[PDB]
Coordinates of C-alpha atoms and ligand atoms in Angstrom, one line a residue:
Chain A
X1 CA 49.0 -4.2 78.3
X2 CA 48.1 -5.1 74.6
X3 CA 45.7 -7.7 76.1
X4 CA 43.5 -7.3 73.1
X5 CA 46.0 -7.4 70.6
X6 CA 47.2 -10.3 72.0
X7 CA 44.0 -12.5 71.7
X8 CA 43.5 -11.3 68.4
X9 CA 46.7 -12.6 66.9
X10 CA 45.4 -16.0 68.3
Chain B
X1 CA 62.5 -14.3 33.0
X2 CA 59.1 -16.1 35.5
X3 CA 58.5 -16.0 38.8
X4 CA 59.4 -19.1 40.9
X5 CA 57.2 -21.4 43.4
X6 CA 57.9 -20.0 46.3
X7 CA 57.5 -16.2 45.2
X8 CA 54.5 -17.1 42.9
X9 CA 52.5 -18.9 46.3
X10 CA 53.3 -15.6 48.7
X11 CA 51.3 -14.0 46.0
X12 CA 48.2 -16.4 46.2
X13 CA 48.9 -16.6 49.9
X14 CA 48.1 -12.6 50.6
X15 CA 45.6 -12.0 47.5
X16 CA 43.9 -14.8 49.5
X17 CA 44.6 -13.1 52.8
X18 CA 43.1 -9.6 51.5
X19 CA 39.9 -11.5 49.8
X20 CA 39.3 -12.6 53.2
X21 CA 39.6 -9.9 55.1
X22 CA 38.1 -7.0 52.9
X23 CA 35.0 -6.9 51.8
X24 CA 34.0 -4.6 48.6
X25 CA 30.5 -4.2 49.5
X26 CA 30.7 -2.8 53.0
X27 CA 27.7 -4.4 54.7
X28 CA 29.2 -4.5 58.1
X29 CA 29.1 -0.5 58.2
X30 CA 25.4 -0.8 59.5
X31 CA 26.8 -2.4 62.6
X32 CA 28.9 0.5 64.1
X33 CA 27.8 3.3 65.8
X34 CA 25.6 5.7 62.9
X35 CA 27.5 8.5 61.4
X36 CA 26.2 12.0 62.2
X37 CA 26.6 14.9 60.4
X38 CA 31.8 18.8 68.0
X39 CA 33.3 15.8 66.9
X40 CA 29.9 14.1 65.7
X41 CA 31.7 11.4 63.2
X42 CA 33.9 10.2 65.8
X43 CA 32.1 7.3 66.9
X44 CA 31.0 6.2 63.4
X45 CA 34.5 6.7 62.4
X46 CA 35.9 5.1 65.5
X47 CA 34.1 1.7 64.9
X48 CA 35.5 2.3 61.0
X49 CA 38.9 2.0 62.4
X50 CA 38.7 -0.6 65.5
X51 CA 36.7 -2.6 62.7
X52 CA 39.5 -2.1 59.8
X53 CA 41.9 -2.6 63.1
X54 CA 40.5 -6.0 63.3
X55 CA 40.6 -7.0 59.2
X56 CA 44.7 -5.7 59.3
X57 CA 45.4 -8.3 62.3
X58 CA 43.5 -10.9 60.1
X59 CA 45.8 -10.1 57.2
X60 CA 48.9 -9.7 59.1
X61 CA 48.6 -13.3 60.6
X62 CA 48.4 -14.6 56.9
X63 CA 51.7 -12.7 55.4
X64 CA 54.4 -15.4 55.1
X65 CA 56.9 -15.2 58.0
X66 CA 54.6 -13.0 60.3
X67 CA 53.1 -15.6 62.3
X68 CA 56.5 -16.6 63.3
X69 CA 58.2 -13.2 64.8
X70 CA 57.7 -13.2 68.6
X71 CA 54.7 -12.0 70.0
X72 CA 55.8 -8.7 70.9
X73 CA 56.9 -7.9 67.2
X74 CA 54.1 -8.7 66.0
X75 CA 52.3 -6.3 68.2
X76 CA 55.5 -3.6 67.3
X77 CA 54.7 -4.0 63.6
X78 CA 51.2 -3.5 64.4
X79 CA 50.9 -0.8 66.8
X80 CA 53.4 1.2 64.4
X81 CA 52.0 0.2 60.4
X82 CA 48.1 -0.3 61.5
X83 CA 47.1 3.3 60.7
X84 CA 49.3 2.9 57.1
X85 CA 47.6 0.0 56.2
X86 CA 44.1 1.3 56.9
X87 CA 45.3 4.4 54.4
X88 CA 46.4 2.0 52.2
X89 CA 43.7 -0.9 52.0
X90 CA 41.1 2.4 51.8
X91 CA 42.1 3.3 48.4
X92 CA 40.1 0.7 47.3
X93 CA 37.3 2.5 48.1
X94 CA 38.3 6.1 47.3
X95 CA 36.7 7.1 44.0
X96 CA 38.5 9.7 42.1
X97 CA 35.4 11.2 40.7
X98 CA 34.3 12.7 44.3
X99 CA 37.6 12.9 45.8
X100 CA 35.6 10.1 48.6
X101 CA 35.4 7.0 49.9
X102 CA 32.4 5.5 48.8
X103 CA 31.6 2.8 51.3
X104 CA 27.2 3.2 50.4
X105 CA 25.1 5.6 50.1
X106 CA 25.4 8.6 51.2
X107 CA 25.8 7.7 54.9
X108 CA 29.0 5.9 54.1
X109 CA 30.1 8.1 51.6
X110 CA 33.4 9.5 53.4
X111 CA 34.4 13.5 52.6
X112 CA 37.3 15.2 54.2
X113 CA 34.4 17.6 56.0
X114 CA 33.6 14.3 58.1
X115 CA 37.2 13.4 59.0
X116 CA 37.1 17.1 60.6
X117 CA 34.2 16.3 62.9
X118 CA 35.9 13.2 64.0
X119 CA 38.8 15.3 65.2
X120 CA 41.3 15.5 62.6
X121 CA 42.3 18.9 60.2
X122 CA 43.8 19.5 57.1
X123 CA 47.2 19.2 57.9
X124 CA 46.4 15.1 57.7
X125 CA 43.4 15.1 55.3
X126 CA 45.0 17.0 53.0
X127 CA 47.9 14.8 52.2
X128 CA 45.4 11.7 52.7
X129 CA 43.4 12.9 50.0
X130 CA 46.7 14.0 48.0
X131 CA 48.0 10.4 48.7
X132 CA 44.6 8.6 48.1
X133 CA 44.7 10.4 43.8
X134 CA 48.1 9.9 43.5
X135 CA 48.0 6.4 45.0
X136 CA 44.8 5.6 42.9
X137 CA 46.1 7.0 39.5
X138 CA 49.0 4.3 39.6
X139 CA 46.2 1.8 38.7
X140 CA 47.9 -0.8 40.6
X141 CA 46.9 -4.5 40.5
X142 CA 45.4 -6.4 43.2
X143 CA 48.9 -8.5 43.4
X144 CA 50.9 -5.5 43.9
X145 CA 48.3 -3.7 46.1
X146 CA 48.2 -6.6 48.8
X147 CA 52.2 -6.9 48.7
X148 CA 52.4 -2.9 49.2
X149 CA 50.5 -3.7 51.9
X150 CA 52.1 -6.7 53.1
X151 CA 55.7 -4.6 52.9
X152 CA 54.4 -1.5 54.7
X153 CA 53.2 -3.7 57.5
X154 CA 56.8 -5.2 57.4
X155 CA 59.0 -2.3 57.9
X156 CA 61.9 -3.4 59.9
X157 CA 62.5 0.2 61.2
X158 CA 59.4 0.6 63.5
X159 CA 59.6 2.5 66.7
X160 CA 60.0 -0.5 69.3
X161 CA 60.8 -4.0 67.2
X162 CA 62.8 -6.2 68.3
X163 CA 64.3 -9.2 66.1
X164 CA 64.6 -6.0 63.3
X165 CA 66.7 -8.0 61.6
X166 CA 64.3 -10.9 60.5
X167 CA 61.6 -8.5 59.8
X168 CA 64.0 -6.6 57.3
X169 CA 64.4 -9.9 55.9
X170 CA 61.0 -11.1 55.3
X171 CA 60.4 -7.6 53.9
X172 CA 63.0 -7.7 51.3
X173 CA 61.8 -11.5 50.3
X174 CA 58.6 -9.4 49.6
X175 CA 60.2 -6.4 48.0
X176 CA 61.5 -8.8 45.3
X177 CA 58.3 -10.8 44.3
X178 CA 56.9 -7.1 44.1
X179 CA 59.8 -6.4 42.0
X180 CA 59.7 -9.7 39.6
X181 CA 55.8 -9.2 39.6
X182 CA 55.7 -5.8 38.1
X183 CA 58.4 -6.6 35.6
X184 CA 57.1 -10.0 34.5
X185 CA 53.4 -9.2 34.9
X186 CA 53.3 -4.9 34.4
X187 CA 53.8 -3.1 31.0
X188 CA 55.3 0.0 31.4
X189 CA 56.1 -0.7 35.2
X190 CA 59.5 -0.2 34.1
X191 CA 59.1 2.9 36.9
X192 CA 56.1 1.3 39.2
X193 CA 58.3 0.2 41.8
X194 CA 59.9 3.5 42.5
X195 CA 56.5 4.7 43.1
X196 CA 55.4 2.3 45.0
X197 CA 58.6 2.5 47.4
X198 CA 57.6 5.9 47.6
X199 CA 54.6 6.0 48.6
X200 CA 55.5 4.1 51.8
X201 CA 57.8 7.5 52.5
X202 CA 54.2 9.5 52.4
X203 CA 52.7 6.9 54.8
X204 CA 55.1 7.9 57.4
X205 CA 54.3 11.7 57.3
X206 CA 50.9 11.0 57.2
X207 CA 50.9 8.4 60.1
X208 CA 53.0 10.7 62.4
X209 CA 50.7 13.7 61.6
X210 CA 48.3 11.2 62.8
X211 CA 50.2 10.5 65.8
X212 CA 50.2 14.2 66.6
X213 CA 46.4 15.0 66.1
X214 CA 45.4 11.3 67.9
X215 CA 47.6 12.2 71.1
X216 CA 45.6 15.2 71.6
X217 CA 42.4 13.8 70.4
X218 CA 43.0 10.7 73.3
X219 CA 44.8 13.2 75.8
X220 CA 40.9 15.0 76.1
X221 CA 39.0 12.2 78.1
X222 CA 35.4 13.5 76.5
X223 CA 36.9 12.4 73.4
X224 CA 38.9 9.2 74.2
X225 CA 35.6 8.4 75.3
X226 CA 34.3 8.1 72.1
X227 CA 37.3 5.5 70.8
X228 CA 37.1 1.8 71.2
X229 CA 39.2 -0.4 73.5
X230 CA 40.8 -1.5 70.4
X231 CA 41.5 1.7 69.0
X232 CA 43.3 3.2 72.2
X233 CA 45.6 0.0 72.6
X234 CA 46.6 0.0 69.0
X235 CA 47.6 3.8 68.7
X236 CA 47.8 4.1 72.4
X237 CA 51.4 4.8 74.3
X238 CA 51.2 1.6 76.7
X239 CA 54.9 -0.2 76.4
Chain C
X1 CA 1.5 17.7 109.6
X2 CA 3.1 18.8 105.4
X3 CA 6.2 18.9 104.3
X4 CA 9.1 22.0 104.4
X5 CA 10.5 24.3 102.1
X6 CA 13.8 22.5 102.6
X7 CA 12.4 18.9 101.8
X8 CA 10.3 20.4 99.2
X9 CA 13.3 22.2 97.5
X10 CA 15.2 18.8 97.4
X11 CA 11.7 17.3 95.5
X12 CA 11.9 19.6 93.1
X13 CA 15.5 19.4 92.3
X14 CA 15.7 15.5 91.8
X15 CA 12.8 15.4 90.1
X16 CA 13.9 18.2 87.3
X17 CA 17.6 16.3 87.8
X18 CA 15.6 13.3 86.9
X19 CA 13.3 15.2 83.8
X20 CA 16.4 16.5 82.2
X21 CA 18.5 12.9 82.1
X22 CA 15.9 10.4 81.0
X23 CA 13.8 10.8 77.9
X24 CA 10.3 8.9 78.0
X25 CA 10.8 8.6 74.2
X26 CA 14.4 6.5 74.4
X27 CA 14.8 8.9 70.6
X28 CA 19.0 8.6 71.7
X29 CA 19.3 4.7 71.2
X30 CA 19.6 4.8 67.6
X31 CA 22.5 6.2 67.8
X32 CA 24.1 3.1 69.7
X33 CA 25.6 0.1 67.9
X34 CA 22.6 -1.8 66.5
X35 CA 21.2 -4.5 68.6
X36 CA 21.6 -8.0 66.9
X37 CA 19.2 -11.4 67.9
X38 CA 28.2 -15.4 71.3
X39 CA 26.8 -12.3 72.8
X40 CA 26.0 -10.5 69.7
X41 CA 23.7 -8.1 72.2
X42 CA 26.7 -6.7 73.3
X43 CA 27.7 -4.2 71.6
X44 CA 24.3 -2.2 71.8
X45 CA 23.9 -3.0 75.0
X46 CA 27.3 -1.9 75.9
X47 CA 26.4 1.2 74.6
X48 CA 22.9 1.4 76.2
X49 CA 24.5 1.2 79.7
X50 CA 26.9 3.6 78.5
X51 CA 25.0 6.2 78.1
X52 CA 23.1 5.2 80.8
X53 CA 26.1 6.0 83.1
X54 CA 26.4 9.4 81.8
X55 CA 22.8 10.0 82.3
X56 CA 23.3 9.0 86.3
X57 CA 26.2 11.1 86.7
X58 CA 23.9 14.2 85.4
X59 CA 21.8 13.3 88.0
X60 CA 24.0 13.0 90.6
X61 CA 25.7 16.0 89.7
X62 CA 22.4 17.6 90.5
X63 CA 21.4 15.5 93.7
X64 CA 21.6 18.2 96.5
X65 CA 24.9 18.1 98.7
X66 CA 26.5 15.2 96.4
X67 CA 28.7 18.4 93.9
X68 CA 29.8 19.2 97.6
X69 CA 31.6 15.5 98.4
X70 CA 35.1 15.0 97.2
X71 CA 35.4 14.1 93.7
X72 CA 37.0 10.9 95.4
X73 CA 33.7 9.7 97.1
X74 CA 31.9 11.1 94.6
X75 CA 33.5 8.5 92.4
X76 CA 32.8 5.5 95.0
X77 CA 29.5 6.1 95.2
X78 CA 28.8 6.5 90.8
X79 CA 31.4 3.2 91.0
X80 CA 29.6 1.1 93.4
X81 CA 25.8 2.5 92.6
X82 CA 26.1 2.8 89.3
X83 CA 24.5 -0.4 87.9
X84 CA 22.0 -0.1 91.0
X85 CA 20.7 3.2 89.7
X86 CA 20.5 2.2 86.3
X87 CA 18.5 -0.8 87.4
X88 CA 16.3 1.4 89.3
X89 CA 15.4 4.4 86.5
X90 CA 15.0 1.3 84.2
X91 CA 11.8 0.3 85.3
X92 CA 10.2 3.3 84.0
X93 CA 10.6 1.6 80.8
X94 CA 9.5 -2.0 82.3
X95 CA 6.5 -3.6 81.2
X96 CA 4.6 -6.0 83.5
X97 CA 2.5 -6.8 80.1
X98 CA 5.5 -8.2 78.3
X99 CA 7.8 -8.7 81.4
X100 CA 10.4 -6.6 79.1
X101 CA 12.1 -2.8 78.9
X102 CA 9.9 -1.9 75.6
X103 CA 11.8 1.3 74.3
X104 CA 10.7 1.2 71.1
X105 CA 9.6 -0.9 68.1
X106 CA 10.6 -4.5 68.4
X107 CA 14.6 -3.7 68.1
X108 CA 14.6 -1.8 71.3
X109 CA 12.1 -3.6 73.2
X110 CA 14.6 -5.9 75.6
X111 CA 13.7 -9.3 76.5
X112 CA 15.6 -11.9 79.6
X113 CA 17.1 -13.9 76.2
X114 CA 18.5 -10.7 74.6
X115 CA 20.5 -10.1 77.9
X116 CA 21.7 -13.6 78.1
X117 CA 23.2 -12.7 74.6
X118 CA 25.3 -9.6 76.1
X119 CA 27.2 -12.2 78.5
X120 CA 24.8 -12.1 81.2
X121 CA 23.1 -15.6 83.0
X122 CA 19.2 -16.1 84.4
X123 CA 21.2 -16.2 87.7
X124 CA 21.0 -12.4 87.1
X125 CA 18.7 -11.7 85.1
X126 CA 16.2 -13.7 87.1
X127 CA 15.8 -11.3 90.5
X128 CA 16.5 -8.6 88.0
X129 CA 13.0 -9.2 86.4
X130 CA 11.2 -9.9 89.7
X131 CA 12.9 -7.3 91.3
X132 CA 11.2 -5.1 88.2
X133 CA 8.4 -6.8 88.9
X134 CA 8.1 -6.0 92.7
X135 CA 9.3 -2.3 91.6
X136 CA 6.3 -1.0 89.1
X137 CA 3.6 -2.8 91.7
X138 CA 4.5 -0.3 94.5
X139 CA 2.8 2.3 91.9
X140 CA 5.3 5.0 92.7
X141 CA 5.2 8.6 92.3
X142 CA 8.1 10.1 90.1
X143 CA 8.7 11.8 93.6
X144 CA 9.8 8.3 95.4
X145 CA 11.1 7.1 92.4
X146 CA 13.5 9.8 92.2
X147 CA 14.2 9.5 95.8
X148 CA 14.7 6.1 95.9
X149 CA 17.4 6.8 92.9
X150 CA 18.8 9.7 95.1
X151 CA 18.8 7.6 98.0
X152 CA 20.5 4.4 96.6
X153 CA 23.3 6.9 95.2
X154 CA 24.3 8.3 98.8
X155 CA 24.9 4.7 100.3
X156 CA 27.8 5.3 102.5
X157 CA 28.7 1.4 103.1
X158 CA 30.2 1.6 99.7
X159 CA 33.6 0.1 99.1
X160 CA 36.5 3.5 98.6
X161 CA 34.2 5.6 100.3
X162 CA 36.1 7.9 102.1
X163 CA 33.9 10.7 104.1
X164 CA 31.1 8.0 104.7
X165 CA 29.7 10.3 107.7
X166 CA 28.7 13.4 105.3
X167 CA 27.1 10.5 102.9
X168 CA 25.5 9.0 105.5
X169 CA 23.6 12.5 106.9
X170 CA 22.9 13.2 103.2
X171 CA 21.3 10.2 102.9
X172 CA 19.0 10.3 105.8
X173 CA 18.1 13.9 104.7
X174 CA 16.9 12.7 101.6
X175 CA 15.4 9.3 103.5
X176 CA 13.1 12.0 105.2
X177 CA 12.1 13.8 102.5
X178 CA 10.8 10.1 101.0
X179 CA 8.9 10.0 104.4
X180 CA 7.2 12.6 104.7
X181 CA 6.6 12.5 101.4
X182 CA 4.7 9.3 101.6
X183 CA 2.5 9.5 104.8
X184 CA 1.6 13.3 103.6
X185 CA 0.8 12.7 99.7
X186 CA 0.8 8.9 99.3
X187 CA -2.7 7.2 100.5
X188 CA -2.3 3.3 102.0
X189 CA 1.5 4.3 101.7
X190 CA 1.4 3.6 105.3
X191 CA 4.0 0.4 104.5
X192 CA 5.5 1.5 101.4
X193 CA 8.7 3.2 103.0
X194 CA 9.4 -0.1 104.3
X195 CA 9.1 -1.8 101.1
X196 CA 11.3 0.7 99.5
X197 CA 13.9 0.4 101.8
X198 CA 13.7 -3.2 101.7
X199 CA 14.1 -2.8 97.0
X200 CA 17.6 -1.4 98.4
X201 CA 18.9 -4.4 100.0
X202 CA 17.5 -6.7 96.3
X203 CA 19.6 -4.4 94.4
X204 CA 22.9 -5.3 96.7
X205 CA 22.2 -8.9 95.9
X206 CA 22.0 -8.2 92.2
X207 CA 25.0 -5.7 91.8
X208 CA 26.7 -8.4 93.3
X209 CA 25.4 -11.0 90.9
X210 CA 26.4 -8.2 88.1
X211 CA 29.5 -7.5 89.6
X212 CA 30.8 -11.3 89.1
X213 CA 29.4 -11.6 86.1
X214 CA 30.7 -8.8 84.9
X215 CA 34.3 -9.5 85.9
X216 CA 34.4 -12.8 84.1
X217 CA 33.1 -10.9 80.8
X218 CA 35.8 -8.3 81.2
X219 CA 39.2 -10.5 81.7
X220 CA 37.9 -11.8 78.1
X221 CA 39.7 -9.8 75.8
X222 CA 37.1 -10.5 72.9
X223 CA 34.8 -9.0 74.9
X224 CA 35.9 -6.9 77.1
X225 CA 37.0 -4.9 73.3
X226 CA 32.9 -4.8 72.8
X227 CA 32.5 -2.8 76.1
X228 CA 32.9 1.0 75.8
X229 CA 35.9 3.3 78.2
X230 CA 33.0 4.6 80.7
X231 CA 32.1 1.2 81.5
X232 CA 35.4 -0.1 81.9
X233 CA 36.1 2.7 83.7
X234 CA 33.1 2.8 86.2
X235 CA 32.7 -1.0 86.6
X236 CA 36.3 -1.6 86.5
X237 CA 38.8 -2.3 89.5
X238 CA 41.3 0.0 89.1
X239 CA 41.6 2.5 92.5
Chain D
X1 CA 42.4 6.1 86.4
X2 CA 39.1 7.8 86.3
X3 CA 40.4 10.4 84.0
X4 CA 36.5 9.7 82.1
X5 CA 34.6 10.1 85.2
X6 CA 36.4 13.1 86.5
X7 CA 36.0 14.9 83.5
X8 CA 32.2 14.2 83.4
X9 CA 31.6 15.0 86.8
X10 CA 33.3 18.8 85.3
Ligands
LIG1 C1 39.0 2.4 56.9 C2 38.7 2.1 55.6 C3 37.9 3.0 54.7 C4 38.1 4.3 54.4 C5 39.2 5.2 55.0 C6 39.0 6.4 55.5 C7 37.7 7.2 55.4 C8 37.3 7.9 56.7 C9 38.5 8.5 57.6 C10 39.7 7.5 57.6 C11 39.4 6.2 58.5 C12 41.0 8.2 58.1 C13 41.1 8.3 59.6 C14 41.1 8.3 60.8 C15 41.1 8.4 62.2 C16 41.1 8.4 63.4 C17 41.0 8.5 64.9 C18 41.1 7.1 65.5 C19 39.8 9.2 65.4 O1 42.2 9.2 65.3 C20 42.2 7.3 57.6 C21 41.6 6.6 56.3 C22 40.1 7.2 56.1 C23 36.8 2.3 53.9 C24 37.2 0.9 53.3 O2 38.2 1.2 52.3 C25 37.9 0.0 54.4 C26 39.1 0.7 55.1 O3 39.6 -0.1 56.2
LIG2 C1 19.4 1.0 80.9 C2 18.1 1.5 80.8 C3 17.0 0.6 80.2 C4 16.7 -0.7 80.5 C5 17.5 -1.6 81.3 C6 17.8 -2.9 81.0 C7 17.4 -3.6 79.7 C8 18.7 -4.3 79.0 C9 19.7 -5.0 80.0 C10 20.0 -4.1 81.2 C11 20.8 -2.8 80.7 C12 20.8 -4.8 82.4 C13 22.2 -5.0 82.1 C14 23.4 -5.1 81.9 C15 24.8 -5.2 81.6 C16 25.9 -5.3 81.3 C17 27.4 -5.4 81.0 C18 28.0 -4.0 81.0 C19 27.5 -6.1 79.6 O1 28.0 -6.2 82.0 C20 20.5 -4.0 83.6 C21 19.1 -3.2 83.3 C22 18.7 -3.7 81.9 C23 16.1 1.4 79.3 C24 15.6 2.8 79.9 O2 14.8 2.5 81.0 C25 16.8 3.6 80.4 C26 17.7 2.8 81.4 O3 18.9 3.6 81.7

């Protein structure tokens, strides 16, 4: 997923 | 011998980058879950590490080059280096007098004993702490503490990166203003660097002995409980 | 005309279920992430419903014939009722003098406005706080009020329930305990079954209001990261 | 998933 990680890094 | 432009405005670029993201008083500690002293630190020291999670995607995005890998390497780097960085960036609050970090009072005053009831043994804290003196005791400056930091992060051999070969790249660029820096700026450095290579060698014990005790930790459901959505992606197995 | 041993057993049971999962004194929410006044409620009430969860799951657990379902349909019903239940047990903490949930000092006293700052909209909260309302004017004894909970949990039109013909008898069991219950020890209660059976169909209106709500909150990633695994988990649409 | 719910449910 990484669909946090994502939105994090913008 | 002086450093150049370009090397001289990486440096104000991640001592900027650090400023930003770390703050030496710790007043955001009263916002996560309180520490209690099976497994009662875990959720204090879960929000720790989702919150520091969140301070090393802050500083990653501001290391020269980084914002420019592709998505997913960026996300390889991270995944992989987060739990080094957090080791590394906590030094600054380790205190060689009580062998702790002192974060405040003595609710966030961190002893080995509370890593325990957050899941983890000595086979990690014991090196931690061993790292923590040995990493403290080479009285490094802020400049060469936020490009350790900035290397670690960009370690071209990381289990699932990409475009390795740009990330190697960036990291050498690095490894020489580190270099320059020490010899230009650091009096009896003549050895620093060595030391400072090494201790990312001791990051990688430590962060797969981390590896280990976290995959059983997040394997036992009344524990992964505990952890924050952040902190399962981050160290968790997802591809 | 007075009530069984049977039906009498099953009173005794919910109400100790209920005794032994919900503490008049709310002493366990300092323990959460502290509340804060873009949804900076969040995390503590993330954490409220959390535990909250757990708490209904006890008391399921102990709900006679419910341990006996599948741990499939058992899982439909926590799923689906969840937020019904919590809704439900919640008003034991409602006050029609403040029109809030005062557990405690002014940080854990919950107003409409502090919900609004966890992600959630007056279309909600609205019916939510008349449907409180409506709740703590029936007077009920801790005997309907735990049967109404017990009730509400073995709804077998819930979406993924599997054996909805055992949850369905179970249910009616339990609806004639509440029955008996009422015309036998509750005066003037001659139309209060109807009026609790009727609090059922408002809390299908507002789990559905939740439901949406919630959905939106939870495909944002900034938030979602606020919410904790049980609640993802529970209120989540993974099969 | 339900690995969390399982579990609490013993
Ligand atoms: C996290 C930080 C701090 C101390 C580090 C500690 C003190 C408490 C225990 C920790 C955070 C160790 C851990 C862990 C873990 C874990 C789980 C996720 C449970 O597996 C690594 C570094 C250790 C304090 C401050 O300098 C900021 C830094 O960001
Ligand atoms: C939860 C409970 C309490 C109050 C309920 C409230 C007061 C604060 C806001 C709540 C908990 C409402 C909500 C929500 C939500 C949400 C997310 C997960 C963010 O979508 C429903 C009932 C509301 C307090 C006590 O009686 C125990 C009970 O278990």
């Amino acid at each position: 997923r990484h669909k946090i990680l994502h939105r994090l890094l913008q | 011998h002086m450093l150049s432009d370009e090397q001289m405005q990486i440096i104000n670029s991640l001592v900027e980058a650090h400023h930003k993201t770390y703050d030496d008083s710790y007043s955001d500690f009263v916002r996560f879950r309180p520490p209690v002293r099976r497994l009662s630190m875990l959720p204090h020291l879960a929000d720790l590490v989702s919150y520091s999670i969140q301070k090393v995607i802050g500083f990653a995005k501001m290391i020269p080059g980084f914002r420019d890998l592709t998505a997913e390497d960026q996300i390889a780097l991270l995944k992989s280096s987060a739990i080094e960085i957090i080791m590394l960036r906590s030094n600054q609050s380790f205190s060689l007098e009580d062998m702790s970090w002192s974060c405040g009072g003595p609710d966030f005053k961190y002893c080995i004993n509370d890593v325990t009831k957050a899941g983890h043994t000595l086979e990690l804290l014991e090196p931690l702490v061993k790292f923590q003196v040995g990493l403290k005791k080479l009285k490094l400056h802020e400049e060469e503490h936020v490009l350790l930091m900035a290397i670690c992060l960009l370690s071209p051999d990381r289990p699932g990166v990409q475009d390795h070969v740009r990330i190697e790249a960036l990291q050498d660029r690095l490894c020489d203003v580190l270099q320059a820096y020490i010899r230009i700026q650091h009096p009896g450095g003549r050895l620093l660097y060595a030391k400072m290579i090494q201790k990312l060698a001791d990051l990688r014990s430590l962060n797969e002995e981390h590896s280990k005790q976290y995959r059983s930790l997040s394997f036992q459901p009344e524990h992964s409980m505990q952890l924050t959505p952040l902190v399962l992606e981050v160290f968790g197995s997802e591809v």
